[PDB]
Design a protein around this nucleic acid. Structure first.
Ligand code: CA
Ligand code: CA
Ligand code: MG
Ligand code: MG
Ligand code: MG
Lengths: 152, 153
DNA sequence: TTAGGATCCTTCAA
DNA sequence: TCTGCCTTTTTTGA
DNA sequence: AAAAGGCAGA
DNA sequence: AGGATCCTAA
């Protein structure tokens, strides 16, 4: 677990509150115990012209990668343990996405117990809804109520 | 009056401006100005109006400027030359993507007195406007230093 | 089964 | 003439 | 985001 | 920005 410089975290928190996204998803999948998987992602988008700024993030954060979609590029961090460490340090400085960050942390902490009980998995799905409600969500499909058909 | 801004504020805000902000220089045709154009310099931060509270707070923090709504979004705007120069002076050290535009704005503001004095000097400052627009993701710009160049009266 | 990655779309919020 | 505000539009860059 | 414009008082 | 869906090593 890298400890990040405070002045870097201050600047990055501002940048993230601007061009960043803290995303939580429920994805249907038949192979998973409760027929769904949780996915958590920290992302920063930039026009591919400024991909260099994202390549620098990779180096400064120490983990994650940059993916180019053509017009725009994304810094992506998904790996659970580094994500938890990163958001823990970032969160105090966030002003617009602080709640989403803290919901992500809470979800991560509950993942072990979420795989053992459908009631617990559902509850955790409800925190995912909460993150989506905080985001400017516009194309969401799978919600905790989708999951609530573990009511079989 | 030359408000002094605090370090942790400037650091966070520099980040946020590199994200959702814009540092804009324009040449506005206007027949009642000395050389038939007015230079306008703007610092702007955009956000969805549901988050206008964040922009209103920027008025309190920067201590000048104002917020306007427009469709589904809001903008903090600072265009007043003396405070804008003071603010960008202190913000610039921490900018990463918009540092050059901020410094060009400062250079422009410092030359304005003597831009009113020579057409050739007015033209050169206009080329600094050009450079800022180049650095930005410019897509609907119309009036450029070249427009100004006649002026060949 | 699980976790992370790869690839792409949708609709704005800049 | 000048300068602080205002008010809308275009096209993405998120 | 990054322009385009307009009005009015000093 | 904020999702969606497919894939495959572990
Ligand atoms: Ca919302
Ligand atoms: Ca450009
Ligand atoms: Mg934003
Ligand atoms: Mg941006
Ligand atoms: Mg943005």
């Amino acid at each position: 677990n890298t400890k990040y410089n405070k002045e870097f975290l201050l600047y990055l928190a501002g940048f993230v509150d601007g061009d960043g996204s803290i995303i939580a998803q429920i994805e249907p999948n038949q192979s998973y115990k409760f027929k769904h998987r949780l996915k958590l992602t920290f992302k920063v988008t930039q026009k591919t012209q400024r991909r260099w700024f994202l390549d620098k993030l990779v180096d400064e954060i120490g983990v994650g990668y940059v993916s180019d979609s053509g017009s725009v590029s994304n810094y992506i961090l998904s790996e659970i343990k580094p994500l938890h460490n990163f958001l823990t340090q970032l969160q105090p400085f966030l002003k617009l996405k602080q709640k989403q960050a803290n919901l992500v942390l809470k979800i991560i902490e509950q993942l072990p117990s979420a795989k053992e009980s459908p009631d617990k998995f559902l509850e955790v799905c409800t925190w995912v809804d909460q993150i989506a409600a905080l985001n400017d969500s516009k194309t969401r499909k799978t919600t905790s109520e989708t999951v609530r058909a573990v009511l079989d």
